Curated annotation (Swiss-Prot), chains A, B, C, D:
Signal peptide: none annotated. The C-terminal ANK repeats prevent the assembly of the supra-tetrameric filaments. Synthesized as a 74-kDa cytosolic precursor which is proteolytically processed by the mitochondrial-processing peptidase (MPP) via a 72-kDa intermediate to yield the mature mitochondrial 68- and 65-kDa subunits. This is Glutaminase kidney isoform, mitochondrial. Isoform 1 and isoform 3 are detected in brain cortex. Isoform 3 is highly expressed in astrocytoma, ganglioglioma and ependymoma. Isoform 1 is highly expressed in brain and kidney, but not detected in liver. Isoform 3 is highly expressed in heart and pancreas, detected at lower levels in placenta, lung, pancreas and kidney, but is not detected in liver. Isoform 2 is expressed in cardiac and skeletal muscle. It comes from Homo sapiens.
Amino acid sequence: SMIPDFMSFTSHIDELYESAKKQSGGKVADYIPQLAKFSPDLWGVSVCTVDGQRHSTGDTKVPFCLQSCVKPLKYAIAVNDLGTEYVHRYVGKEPSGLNKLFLNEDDKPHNPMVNAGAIVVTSLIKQGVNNAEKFDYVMQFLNKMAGNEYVGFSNATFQSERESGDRNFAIGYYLKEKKCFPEGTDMVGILDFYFQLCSIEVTCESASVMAATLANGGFCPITGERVLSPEAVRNTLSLMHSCGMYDFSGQFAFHVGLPAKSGVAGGILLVVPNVMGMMCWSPPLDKMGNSVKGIHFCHDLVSLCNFHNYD
Amino acid sequence: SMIPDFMSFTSHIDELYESAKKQSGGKVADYIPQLAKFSPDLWGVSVCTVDGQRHSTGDTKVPFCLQSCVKPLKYAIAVNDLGTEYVHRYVGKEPSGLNKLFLNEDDKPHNPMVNAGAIVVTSLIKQGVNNAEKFDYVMQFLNKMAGNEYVGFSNATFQSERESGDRNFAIGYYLKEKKCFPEGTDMVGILDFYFQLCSIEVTCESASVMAATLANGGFCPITGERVLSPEAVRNTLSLMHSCGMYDFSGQFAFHVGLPAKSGVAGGILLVVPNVMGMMCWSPPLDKMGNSVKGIHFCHDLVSLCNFHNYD
Amino acid sequence: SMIPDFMSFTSHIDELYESAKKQSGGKVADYIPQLAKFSPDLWGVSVCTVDGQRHSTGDTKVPFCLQSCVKPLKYAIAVNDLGTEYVHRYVGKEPSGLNKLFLNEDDKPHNPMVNAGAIVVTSLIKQGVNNAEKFDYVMQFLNKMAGNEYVGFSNATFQSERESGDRNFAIGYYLKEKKCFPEGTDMVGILDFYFQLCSIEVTCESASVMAATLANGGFCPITGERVLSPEAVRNTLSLMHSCGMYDFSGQFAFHVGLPAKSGVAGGILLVVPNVMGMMCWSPPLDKMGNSVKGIHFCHDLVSLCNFHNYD
Amino acid sequence: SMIPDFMSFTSHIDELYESAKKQSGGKVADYIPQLAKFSPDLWGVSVCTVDGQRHSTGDTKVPFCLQSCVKPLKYAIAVNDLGTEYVHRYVGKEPSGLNKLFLNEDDKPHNPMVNAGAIVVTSLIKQGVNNAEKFDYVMQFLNKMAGNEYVGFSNATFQSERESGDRNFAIGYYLKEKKCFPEGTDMVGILDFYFQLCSIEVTCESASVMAATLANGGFCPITGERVLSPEAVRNTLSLMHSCGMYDFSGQFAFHVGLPAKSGVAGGILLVVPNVMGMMCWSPPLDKMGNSVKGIHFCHDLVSLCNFHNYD
């Protein structure tokens, strides 16, 4: 325990929250109406310790889509059900250079955090059963990770993502061409499942619980239940540490030093190993595609509380 | 006229033909049954001068698919009907480096000789009318270029190419994503038209007449009719000179110095400006994807007859 | 403390040591005689806890050159004397893609762990004074980090490295061309200083103490003295975590999860934050350029003692 | 003969000259004082037919440095004295992609038209003799190519190029590292010889005669003497056609279709096979590094006189 008095730590979270709030830069994603809708002023931070202690400030109950924030989670599920060796016969274990190919030196997506990786990972989960069944499987899993808190679905986002993801289809066919999917995979059906997963909704509060589960070696801080295998958690964290922030991953690993994962909805799934889970959210993104207020908050948190991986 | 006595020149063609015949290396394309079918021993050479003088040796009447050999032709048609400026707002004018992106520094395919280029070019031809109509349009055009000689269609090849071109679909969606097609293009419909064009059949004899048309500033050596605009012909030749032989383009431009275009069927559309048209054919391809006997023949022809662009 | 009974932990180190010993693969660097000299059978492991507790097994007193192992150290010194902001105006903070340019998107070496980076970093240290003086400065520093244990110099290696580093000169001139050095830098003089630094000698024992200093927030476990600033230590560790193992950095960060740095001499500077410092050594390197026995040992250590950054 | 009445053709040259004269854009190279010196208003065009017929307009007698214009020439000399096979064991035969490596897929410079290529080519010429002797050898050669017209040397340029070519040194050491030079080459001595060659001076008039020699299968139009082997001339032309205009090579080959070679001094060595040699000169260069007035003139010449390789 680095937070001796949670109650006082909470007071610092609010101060940091207020500080980041003053950062108004960035543009709200608008490649689809469902994301343009959001007000740039929404800003919420939710903490959930390994204990089970909670704390929120800002718009922490407004539902938003996980988007790329779901990548770490579905990867954790795959490693959990199939183990490191199998999962990684299809996807890499490290950051790529940056233009921006699809496959690496072995015709495998560089890692589970980039789109091609997430797509392949999606094709490994619950093979055999139909999409509908696969979807409930993952939903059930996400609920355990969130200790049964809010986990919804945005059909509007799903539909917009599907009838607009031309690049995800390009990736889909390319991977199919390079034989990157398991024998007998319905490629188009996987892209569909992929769009659905990106459309799952959460709130800063429910997500913080999911982060805390990863922060707690796979045990839900608020139910005590074992959701993910130790193996799965460690893998997910390692990859979030190196590829969770898009093109900002390097800077983030160097300056913040914490496993995190951003999403185009403006969310940032943050994890402080053996301490707490967190979810920052604010629609305005920067050139890198990360939440402006979120990035700011993270830097402040590590400076103030010295949570950096190497202190 | 560099061939004072055609009759004697013909005797040299046969000698070269016989020489190349001894080259048995290479593997016959087999990504689809329609190409695997072919016997590695088929070998045919057909000449057609600017005059109209013909000459054949070897299997010059066995129908085979143009495949990539159609690229120069459909490009010539586009420039003919739309002019250099318009056509090139969508496709580049030079060789790429070699891994192997899809678009260039301006989000345009590097040139009409690579798949992404050919696909975009296909989307420019006869816009408005339906596929069936577009197809007849091109067929009519190919007939004029061949002075009405053999020009067929392989439905079997078309079907195999379609239900197997995963990479061409990847390219299709990527180009659609990057807005590379003209406003209101039915991308999937274009890929269909593209597969059809690759399935058009010809014989060394009919093709040599098409080459001769390009060799004759756009006039069919055997009908005297103007098929392509001077502008269109010159453009096509320039691009065949630099991007007609896949990864062998550089070596070919340096050692042979003649506008040419190979295809996976084993054909090599050759052009000796203001002299003659030619079509070499032999199913066995080398690592580069060019006909082994064809490449050999070309080198011998330029050494013997000093036809190199810079003699 | 994760090692409750050091005495028993020591017994496990020996078991791991013995296990790795059975790995005879790899080739001993031979681009210069000074490295070819070494026997592939040399193998030594030395531990030094944050306490000051020591333990060695194998050839832990045979002097060998730090080579690339010096990179983390001279970087730590620069950040210590100049701070993060200044140092990083000249060198990057993350892994590159892999062919293998010299500069990044901003005309700066990608990071201090690659040759171009180390060279620039070398040009920042103790500017003003002459080489001889600069060298003693660093030597004095290395001694404090090693609690005054063995720190020598191989003039033979230095001479061979100098009269043979054509690629380091290429890098030198390229950086000078791109204005990557501080105003008024004697480029050739820096390369000289660089070759000298690579020729500094240590033993598994003295090096383990240096690693322990980094493992101890900058305090020499055996003298209690503050050698490096907290800022400097954290930076060095972050970069060792992501770029310390050449092309194996990704795999290493994923499977081992510990700050490390290899060298062509066969050494591997290992660090277990807040626990211990370590130095593995065995001349036979693998294709990646890392010590075969060393890599093996590291994997075994993390599996056995669960020292991975995310357990 | 495409120019039936030279006298009238001359009248068109002057019209084109006057037209290009109105193009004032571009910046005069200034990386060294010797080039900054030049007035942006200097503009000269000199023709020299295969006959021996001359014609000049503009500043055709003001001496300027060949710079990269010497590349085609020293390559022609190497092929002449060593033949295609030998020369090309060290240098490639085609355009590279564009960032901008030094070697190709076989550790050889891409072609003789890029700096790394020119440097290697320089190391092949007159091996054995000392620099001074090598220099006279080439000078003697250049004189024969120019029918003994003006061929000087700028020691000022040489000195500035030498004490400033940090990138050429980077290239020098890199090539030495990759073993790209013939056994026993004094790398630094070659770079010296290289800087000297770039400093050779000519005038539009003397250069046009050199171009005409290449345009005349290796025979000096004004002395009738055989200066270069047919083999050498054809090779040089092929490479000028594809790599003579820096990053504009593709556009130039497509729109102009003529063997050319630009230089940072603002000169453009142009060749119309079997017709004439030409040298355009105007210090203001564009972003690509080619003479603005020169590029303009070339486009106009090919449109007007239909000299394009494929008309």
